[PDB]
Amino acid sequence: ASMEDLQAEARAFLSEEMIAEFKAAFDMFDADGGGDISYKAVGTVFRMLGINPSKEVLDYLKEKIDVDGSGTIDFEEFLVLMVYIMKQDA
The method recorded for this entry reads NMR
Per DSSP, the three-state class of 37 is: strand
Q: Contact 10/82 with Cβ under 8 angstroms?
A: yes
Other C-beta atoms lying within 10 Å of the C-beta of residue 87: 11
Name the CA dihedral angle for 80, 35, 21, 65, rounded to a multiple of 10 degrees.
20
Domains and CATH numbers, the chain: 3-88 (1.10.238.10)
Sign of CA dihedral 31, 37, 38, 43: positive
